[PDB]
Amino acid sequence: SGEYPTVNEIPVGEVRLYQIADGVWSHIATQSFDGAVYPSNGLIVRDGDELLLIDTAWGAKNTAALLAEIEKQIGLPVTRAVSTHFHDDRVGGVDVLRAAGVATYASPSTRRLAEAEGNEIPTHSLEGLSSSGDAVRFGPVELFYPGAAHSTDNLVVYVPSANVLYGGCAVHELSSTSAGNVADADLAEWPTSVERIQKHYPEAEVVIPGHGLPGGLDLLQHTANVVKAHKN
Ligand SMILES: CC(=O)Nc1nc2cccc(-c3c(C(=O)O)[nH]c4c(C(C)C)cccc34)c2s1
Ligand SMILES: [Zn+2]
Ligand SMILES: [Zn+2]
């Protein structure tokens, strides 16, 4: 009923949308992994009379439900999608997207890691993102590679028209007391990567984590703190 939707409020297989700003929504879904249930976020950005999707809804059936929710709530076609790293909460569902006619994109690093992992593989490579601090435009957003953090390939997304920073899994929510799934993370580089984000997007008004509740710029420093404390 208007609050940001939480893990216990979303059955696995359902998807919710949350309006962030004019023309900007997050999508929220839940999935089971290794016997626990987690929420995860993605982004939707209006692109004229089309939509740009950032990240799948973590699985094929969730992603079909995402497309149905978008049609219900927004009614514009998703024409392109970007996955912000290689894990299943970002690329699981790419096959559903592709079969629905959505053009799917990721960095070459993400595509290689997804392939090697046995995850679904976005179709098109996003060049110009291989060095930390790189940025490229993609429709109504900027894609930024901050350096290794949650994963070596993680990208962040900025919506300049709305000052919305989507951190993906490189950014944690404020209630987080752990660094999440660190299997593929670089804990030593993560704080430096966050500092690059902070320097590059000082006017961000909303920061959206990969999992959990949006907030303001404090999520960035909070993430650096949680990661340093995990590493310690
Ligand atoms: C023992 C343990 O794993 N605890 C965890 N707590 C959290 C809290 C928030 C997020 C996560 C979390 C993240 C993330 O951090 O991006 N990715 C996850 C994936 C992908 C690899 C598909 C699977 C399962 C979960 C996550 C976790 S994992
Ligand atoms: Zn991940
Ligand atoms: Zn994640």
Side-chain angles (χ1 to χ4, degrees):
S1 305
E3 283 322 290
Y4 200 81
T6 70
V7 72
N8 310 285
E9 289 167 14
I10 302 165
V12 180
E14 295 191 9
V15 174
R16 312 284 196 272
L17 309 184
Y18 183 91
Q19 186 90 254
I20 296 285
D22 176 37
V24 184
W25 300 255
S26 66
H27 64 83
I28 313 87
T30 55
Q31 188 55 268
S32 173
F33 180 90
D34 288 23
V37 173
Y38 302 89
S40 85
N41 299 318
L43 205 70
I44 302 160
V45 186
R46 189 167 57 234
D47 180 20
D49 60 3
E50 299 173 11
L51 302 174
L52 175 62
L53 181 64
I54 312 299
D55 293 324
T56 68
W58 197 353
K61 286 176 88 166
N62 279 358
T63 300
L66 168 67
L67 293 177
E69 196 69 17
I70 291 173
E71 183 48 33
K72 170 177 188 187
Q73 300 291 351
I74 304 173
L76 295 172
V78 177
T79 58
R80 300 184 287 189
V82 172
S83 294
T84 61
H85 68 278
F86 75 100
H87 288 156
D88 201 43
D89 59 321
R90 308 295 128 195
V91 299
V94 155
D95 290 350
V96 159
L97 296 174
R98 186 176 15 245
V102 180
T104 62
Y105 295 78
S107 75
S109 178
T110 296
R111 293 178 75 259
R112 290 188 306 263
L113 290 165
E115 186 176 346
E117 193 76 15
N119 288 349
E120 294 161 50
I121 310 160
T123 297
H124 299 289
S125 287
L126 297 169
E127 297 295 338
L129 292 164
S130 68
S131 294
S132 62
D134 276 345
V136 303
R137 292 305 309 271
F138 195 94
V141 307
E142 183 171 68
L143 306 179
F144 181 71
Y145 174 53
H150 167 80
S151 64
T152 57
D153 61 323
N154 49 205
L155 301 180
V156 310
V157 180
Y158 193 69
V159 188
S161 72
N163 292 308
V164 171
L165 178 58
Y166 174 87
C169 311
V171 176
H172 281 282
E173 72 175 321
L174 290 173
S175 67
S176 175
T177 65
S178 84
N181 191 328
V182 298
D184 296 313
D186 185 335
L187 300 182
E189 281 304 316
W190 198 334
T192 300
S193 299
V194 163
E195 280 155 32
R196 295 200 183 78
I197 300 169
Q198 290 170 311
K199 198 197 173 24
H200 204 85
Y201 297 114
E203 311 203 310
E205 291 180 22
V206 175
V207 179
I208 301 166
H211 306 265
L213 311 190
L217 278 169
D218 295 315
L219 277 68
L220 300 181
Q221 185 61 48
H222 179 64
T223 297
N225 293 340
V226 169
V227 162
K228 291 159 78 59
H230 180 293
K231 175 156 149 44
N232 292 351

